[PDB]
Amino acid sequence: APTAPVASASSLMSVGYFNGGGDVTAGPGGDINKLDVRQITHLNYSFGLVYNDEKDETNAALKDPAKLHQIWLSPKVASDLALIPTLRKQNPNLKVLLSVGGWGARGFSGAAATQESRAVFIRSAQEIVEKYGLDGIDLDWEYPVNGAWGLVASQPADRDNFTALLKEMRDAFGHKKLVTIAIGANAESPKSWVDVKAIAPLLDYINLMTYDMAYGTQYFNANLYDSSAWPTVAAADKYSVDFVVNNYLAAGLKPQQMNLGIGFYGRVPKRAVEPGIDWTKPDAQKNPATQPYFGPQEIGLFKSLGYDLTKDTYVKYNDIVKKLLNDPQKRFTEHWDDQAKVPWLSVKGADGNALFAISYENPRSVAIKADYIKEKGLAGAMFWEYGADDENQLAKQLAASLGIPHL
Numbered sequence: 001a002p003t004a005p006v007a008s009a010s011s012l013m014s015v016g017y018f019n020g021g022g023d024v025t026a027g028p029g030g031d032i033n034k035l036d037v038r039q040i041t042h043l044n045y046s047f048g049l050v051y052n053d054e055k056d057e058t059n060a061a062l063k064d065p066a067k068l069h070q071i072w073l074s075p076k077v078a079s080d081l082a083l084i085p086t087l088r089k090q091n092p093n094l095k096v097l098l099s100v101g102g103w104g105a106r107g108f109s110g111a112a113a114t115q116e117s118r119a120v121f122i123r124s125a126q127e128i129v130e131k132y133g134l135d136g137i138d139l140d141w142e143y144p145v146n147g148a149w150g151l152v153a154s155q156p157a158d159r160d161n162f163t164a165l166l167k168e169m170r171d172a173f174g175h176k177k178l179v180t181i182a183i184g185a186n187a188e189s190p191k192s193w194v195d196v197k198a199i200a201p202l203l204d205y206i207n208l209m210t211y212d213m214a215y216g217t218q219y220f221n222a223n224l225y226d227s228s229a230w231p232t233v234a235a236a237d238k239y240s241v242d243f244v245v246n247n248y249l250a251a252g253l254k255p256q257q258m259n260l261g262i263g264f265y266g267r268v269p270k271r272a273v274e275p276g277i278d279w280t281k282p283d284a285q286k287n288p289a290t291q292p293y294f295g296p297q298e299i300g301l302f303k304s305l306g307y308d309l310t311k312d313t314y315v316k317y318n319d320i321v322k323k324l325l326n327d328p329q330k331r332f333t334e335h336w337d338d339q340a341k342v343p344w345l346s347v348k349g350a351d352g353n354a355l356f357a358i359s360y361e362n363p364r365s366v367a368i369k370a371d372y373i374k375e376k377g378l379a380g381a382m383f384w385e386y387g388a389d390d391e392n393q394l395a396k397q398l399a400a401s402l403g404i405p406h407l
Contacts, residue, residue: 012373012402013380015180015207015259016040016395017099019387020080021047024059025312030387032080037091038407039392039399041380042178044138044207045080046099048073048128050107050121054153057106069111070124071100081132091407097178098128101140108141109153112161121165122172129177136178136204137169143184145193163198170202182207182261182382185244190251197252206253207382211263213239214313217276217290220359221267223340224372230337230356233289234278240340241369245376255377262369262381262398264388266320266360268313273299297350298357301331316388320345320360332357341368363397370401 016039020029029046037043049059051067062072073081084096101108111121125137144162147154169179181199183189183206190196200206214221216237219230224241232238241260248258270276276290294309302309305323315324324332324345332345333354344359361369373381381398389395 011041011380011404012378013042013205013259013382014040014395014399014402014404015042015044015205015380015382017044017046017383017385019046019385021049021074021077028076029080032083032087035087035386036392037087037094039395039404040091040094041404042095042097042135043087044097044099044382045077045084046385047102047105047140048077048098048100049102049105050100050111052107052110054106054110062107069107069117069120071098071121071128073128081128081134084132084134095135095178097136097138097180098125098132098134099138099140099182100125101142101182103142103148104151105140105142106152108139108144109147109155109158109161112144112158112165113155115164115168118161118165118168122169125169126172129173136173136180138178138180138182138207139166140182142182143186143189143193146186146188159193159195163195163202166199166202178204180204180207182209183248184209185211185213185239187243187247190248190253196248200253200257203257205257205259205379207259208244208248208261209384210241210244210261211384212267214267214269214271214359217271217278219269219271219356220337220340220342220344221269222263222361223337223342223359224365224368225339225341227337227340230340233276234280236279237276241372245378256379258378259380259382260369260373260378262361262366262383262394264317264361264383264385264394266315266317266358268302268307268309268315268358269356270313272356273309273313293349293355295350298347298355301347315358315360317360317362317394318388318390320358321390324358336364341365361394363393366394366397367401370398373402 022028048071051062142148144158211222217233218237272294275288278289342365343362345357346354347357349355
């Protein structure tokens with residue numbers, strides 16, 4: 001122990017995404033004038049996009065050749081960023097970052113390719129951070145090298161180009177603005193996509209996207225540990241939050257550099273609606289490891305509730321409460337998994353059998369993830385996102401369980 005006491009240690013972090021830009025699919029984000037920021041230490045306003053020359057880009061605004069490699073702010077994003085000072089009144093020590101990228105956002109591979117292209121991107125970030133009085137920039141490139149399985153352009157040079165982009169961004173911003181990233185759950189991310197040891201000293205912290213695991217042959221979307229009763233069939237699909245954290249610790253990231261991402265939403269597992277393939281098998285597609293257990297009645301049920309499960313499986317927590325838990329016909333039965341430490345709902349099939357419909361986060365499971373953050377010595381939590389929460393209930397539980405102090 002020290003010979004003299006030290007000042008009060010700063011609290012754990014809670015980094016909340018506010019998806020004010022929205023999507024073309026989901027429409028614009030929420031109303032920044034109604035946003036309550038009392039439960040967070042850092043706000044990631046999302047998303048800025050990247051002007052790019054990828055052939056498959058559909059956003060015509062991003063194709064301006066005069067602005068290639070710069071950051072694009074939609075009208076809604078630019079309007080909202082001008083309103084940041086009004087949020088600071090609720091939480092004067094709040095740090096606000098602009099997040100650039102997101103799932104399906106093109107342009108990083110080209111922007112990162114050369115010192116010259118990186119310099120254009122960085123100068124754009126500097127101008128935006130300065131002119132809107134932000135505290136820093138967050139980069140959500142999904143993903144260097146892998147390209148989110150071909151969804152965005154990618155090349156092997158992305159790995160070391162990403163390091164260079166972050167190093168040159170830190171050089172330009174200095175030590176008085178924040179630079180952070182979101183990083184994927186996939187085990188291949190630290191192995192092949194991102195040089196975590198090289199980038200960690202450049203970044204204020206790293207947000208782990210410890211969610212979106214309800215794919216392939218896996219049932220749960222953000223199980224803390226493996227579920228004993230619902231095991232994943234193909235080894236490459238076997239994920240848990242603890243597995244992801246341990247992968248990044250083994251790759252050399254320190255606990256104090258990582259926030260644990262929490263999803264304020266649920267997913268219907270892809271295993272319900274699409275054959276799950278074990279790619280290690282011969283004739284893998286001919287002999288699926290799992291087969292869909294939803295039929296037309298269950299697909300139609302979700303359609304009647306506003307979800308086309310062939311296109312997306314995402315259900316906001318507020319809609320889980322309103323449409324599923326509070327379904328007037330009480331068609332969804334609630335369950336708890338003792339090892340995954342998350343809730344899940346079943347529906348009765350046409351054959352009368354209970355079927356695993358969706359796993360998600362509730363206050364109980366969020367409190368458990370907060371206690372795990374404390375147990376593992378992590379830096380705090382990150383969450384996606386305010387517009388999916390139900391009157392900030394998950395954000396409030398998270399703050400209470402982490403001990404975030406009040407104003």
